[PDB]
Write a protein that binds this ligand. Structure first.
Ligand SMILES: Cc1cc2nc3c(=O)[nH]c(=O)nc-3n(C[C@H](O)[C@H](O)[C@H](O)COP(=O)(O)OP(=O)(O)OC[C@H]3O[C@@H](n4cnc5c(N)ncnc54)[C@H](O)[C@@H]3O)c2cc1C
Ligand SMILES: Cc1cc2nc3c(=O)[nH]c(=O)nc-3n(C[C@H](O)[C@H](O)[C@H](O)COP(=O)(O)OP(=O)(O)OC[C@H]3O[C@@H](n4cnc5c(N)ncnc54)[C@H](O)[C@@H]3O)c2cc1C
Ligand SMILES: NC(=O)c1ccc[n+]([C@@H]2O[C@H](COP(=O)([O-])OP(=O)(O)OC[C@H]3O[C@@H](n4cnc5c(N)ncnc54)[C@H](OP(=O)(O)O)[C@@H]3O)[C@@H](O)[C@H]2O)c1
Ligand SMILES: NC(=O)c1ccc[n+]([C@@H]2O[C@H](COP(=O)([O-])OP(=O)(O)OC[C@H]3O[C@@H](n4cnc5c(N)ncnc54)[C@H](OP(=O)(O)O)[C@@H]3O)[C@@H](O)[C@H]2O)c1
Lengths: 445, 445
């Protein structure tokens, strides 16, 4: 029987397993599926750990999430089309669940799917090579439970290893002598650490917004965020100042591009991540910027230089969970033969070029959201993934953007229409800034 | 011609290059040598970086050294037999030089040797395999300068990748909810961070002693160190208490095995390291405890299951630099044919078993130092490495041990006789406790 290797059991890899199990139930023959996961459990970025740097096994820590993290977008825009929030929880919950609650939801679906038996945990992939003579990938993996490395052959490899875990960590003059903490978002864990401190947050994207907000919520004396392109531009609280580019540090004094200076106690580098695959040779290794049209991926999933290799979730993300589903169903269908890939590499490269050109046609945020919605629509049309109201999910993101513009610190105190019923989610029992307790127990009451 | 791969350009790898260059100068034909180094420069652990976790390229940070680090033992006991301190700096320096000074000394020797041209920097090794049919090792390496992975064939591989860089990081109840910093020694950089703080130092070996001392020197409010075996036992300062095993944390309250408690602000795990090779398959991968008799290494260097593979510096270390030299000369001679390895695997295994039994015969510290001295003596007798006064080196370590027992905080305010001239080194211009400045400049005046 044909064999498929899935690298990673985060939301993407899990979606891939769910896709195959769903086809098997229909009566389709499916390949053998082996999912390799470095961590001790599934969940990907959502599987929280206090650990930073290297894990208990000596492997790079994957987790980039922190304490107090809540859903940063409306949940209504990431609902699985085949497994609703209502089905999982029974009842209606608010629109921005804490990490532990979304983790439960992710896990609930694959528990029902009975796909855990396909996963090997504590088993980082070390290497993948392809031999055209045999038409097989050789996957080398290390099993930390037995301290033994082995290799096995597969007809396909689906890489779902993430791209928000290997940090971009710039050096600025003074970083090495600064008497204070300098920590990348990747290693950030507990906002309580900076209570009563002046925090400098470098960056102007998703992580800067949220980590700055966590530090603010948990009692930072002040937040100073700095940008090198467009400011975030929100109406910040009184103790939050947005400055232009950092130039250098002299002692604990930060110098900015407009000539202004500020003393800071700690620096959090919210400077993003790189696509990094420590386990791939040149001929298989995806090289791309983080954006909505990923380089060298036909239909955003099939590797143009070897289309028997696929990648999931390698785009930057407005949509998340149901985009990964759409991708996983598509990749599944390509492997099963329900979809046939072009034999013309020129055609695959042109597909990517079209996507890049279309992404770049406008820099408008609503255009970007709609662009990715269009991508999900495109993939869903080409498989049996249950169609869902993508326009409705789109409107949720539009409303979410409006809410953040109005009150950046209170945007999580809002509800959105379910794409299934059209009904507004309930108000949560506690305002975000006062909801210091993380637990799922406290959230669900 | 024959080819040798050296993995790592720390003191061990550097000693290996120097060994081969020395033989070439004698008129011996030598193999091609390729040294792969993950970092941007040589020096191994001594090559300091402010970075922790993953480096700028996304690879695990090798550095385990910190600011304010000074030589841990007498320099007279680690002097190269073929390159004295005098020949280098010219003058006579004190006996405990700061990191930056020793780095310069290390650098000095290999600069003179003209071996840098054999080294590829920013080039972590990804994998090594051996094929018996071809009798070749295939080394796969990633060049971060070009973002390109390649592979090449070698007749020998010499692994000098260190074993004090992948940390042992235990979990204790309360670690994940502790409102304070928890950092393994590997990630410890600036003692100033803990000024005015109550610090818990877990451990009772080299790292606990020195990191605890740095925290003390740089103004920690108090140090509580904890042991699970033998206490360190020194006469500690007034604000330093040694406790038995940590049981758990409840909030910031540490509970110990004797029923006592102590509130702490930060925890530094000085809990040691594992031997960890992310780039080796089972049939080549050394598995061993950290000790003086390393498992599965004939003569402490030749891998018993494939003796064309060698390992340097995998022992725990009383002796350092001149032991690595002795090892490197020995491995060189095996490769050149000046030494012939046994064709009897049982004999190689018996060699290791003898070393283990002899190490275990006594737990006395002086016995342990003499044991490794005997190892260096053994290796040096079997090559043309110049013979030096090993007994004198022993006496230096013995004096060092006694100074530490007398005053653990001031042992660095001592001098020792040169192993070449028998002249007591001059006293430094500032007592250790007062010598806050790191610079080599401040040290040398
Ligand atoms: C800080 C942060 C907050 C976020 N918040 C939200 C949010 O609120 N809502 C939302 O919808 N999205 C959020 N995201 C987006 C996130 O990317 C997706 O939710 C989702 O986690 C991506 O799923 P994935 O499976 O593609 O990747 P990941 O979740 O990164 O999972 C990849 C998996 O691959 C494994 N892996 C990696 N290397 C190897 C190897 N060599 N061998 C084996 N396994 C390996 C990892 O251990 C991991 O389990 C957030 C992202 C970040 C960084
Ligand atoms: C905290 C600390 C303090 C110490 N203080 C002293 C002291 O005062 N005096 C003393 O004599 N000794 C000291 N030591 C001992 C130290 O082990 C030796 O001085 C020496 O650094 C060991 O040299 P090495 O080359 O064997 O290993 P390392 O110094 O660890 O160097 C190994 C090299 O291999 C490289 N490498 C690792 N993996 C890869 C890969 N996959 N591909 C390519 N390259 C790789 C690393 O980047 C590194 O350059 C200390 C050790 C520690 C941990
Ligand atoms: N954290 C979340 O809430 C969350 C949730 C889900 C998904 N994600 C995804 O994660 C992706 C990454 O989010 P992110 O905020 O972590 O990273 P990011 O989007 O790449 O943003 C990095 C920020 O740091 C700045 N920066 C980068 N390098 C810098 C340097 N050397 N000096 C100064 N500033 C620098 C960037 O500015 P320039 O624009 O000038 O480069 C940008 O403002 C997002 O696109 C988002 O999809 C995030
Ligand atoms: N020059 C220096 O200052 C320096 C500094 C660091 C390292 N080194 C070199 O590298 C070696 C390592 O030194 P090291 O101190 O870093 O490591 P180490 O010698 O392995 O010591 C580890 C210490 O932590 C304790 N420990 C380990 N696991 C623990 C756990 N789960 N819970 C509680 N305690 C735990 C150990 O106790 P047990 O004994 O009970 O296991 C031991 O006391 C040394 O032999 C030396 O060669 C040198």
């Amino acid at each position: 029987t044909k064999r498929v290797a899935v690298i990673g059991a985060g939301p993407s890899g899990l979606a891939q397993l769910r896709a195959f199990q769903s086809a098997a139930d229909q009566g389709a023959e499916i390949p053998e599926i082996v999912c390799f996961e470095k961590q001790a459990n599934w969940g990907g970025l959502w599987n929280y750990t206090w650990r930073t740097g290297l894990d208990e096994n000596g492997e790079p820590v994957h987790c980039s999430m922190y304490r107090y993290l809540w859903s940063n977008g409306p949940k209504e825009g990431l609902e699985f089309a085949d497994y609703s929030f209502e089905e999982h929880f029974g009842k209606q919950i608010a629109s921005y669940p804490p990490r532990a609650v979304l983790f439960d939801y992710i896990e609930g679906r694959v528990h029902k799917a009975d796909v855990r038996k396909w996963i090997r945990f504590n088993s980082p992939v070390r290497w993948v090579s392809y031999d055209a003579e045999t038409a097989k990938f050789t996957v080398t993996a290390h099993n930390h439970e037995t301290d033994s490395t082995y290799s096995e052959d597969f007809d396909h490899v689906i890489c779902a290893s993430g791209h928000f875990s290997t940090p971009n960590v710039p050096f600025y003059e003074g970083f090495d002598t600064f008497n204070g903490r300098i920590v990348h978002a990747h290693d950030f864990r507990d906002a309580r650490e900076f209570e009563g401190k002046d925090v400098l947050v470098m960056g102007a994207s998703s992580s800067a917004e949220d980590i700055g907000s966590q530090c603010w919520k948990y009692g930072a004396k002040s937040i100073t965020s700095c940008y090198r392109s467009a400011p975030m531009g929100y109406a910040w609280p009184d103790n939050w100042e947005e400055k232009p580019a950092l130039e250098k540090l002299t002692g604990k004094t930060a110098h900015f591009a407009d000539g202004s200076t500020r003393d800071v106690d700690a620096i959090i580098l919210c400077t993003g991540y790189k696509h990094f695959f420590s386990f791939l040779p040149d001929d298989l290794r995806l090289k791309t910027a983080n954006r909505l049209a990923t380089a060298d991926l036909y239909k955003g999933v099939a590797y143009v230089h070897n289309p028997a290799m696929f990648y999931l979730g390698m785009q930057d993300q407005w949509f998340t969970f149901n985009m990964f589903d759409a991708q996983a169903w598509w990749v599944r269908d390509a492997i099963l033969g329900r979809i046939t890939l072009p034999k013309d590499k020129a055609a695959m490269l042109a597909d990517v070029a079209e996507r890049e050109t279309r992404e770049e046609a406008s820099d408008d945020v609503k255009y970007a959201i709609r662009y990715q919605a269009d991508y999900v629509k495109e993939l869903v049309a080409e498989t049996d993934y249950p169609s869902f109201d993508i326009d409705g999910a789109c409107d949720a993101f539009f409303e979410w953007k409006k809410h953040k513009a109005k009150d950046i610190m209170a945007f999580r105190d809002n509800s959105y229409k379910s794409v299934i019923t059209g009904t507004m989610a309930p108000v949560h029992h506690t305002p975000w800034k006062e909801a210091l307790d993380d637990s799922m127990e406290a959230y669900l009451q």
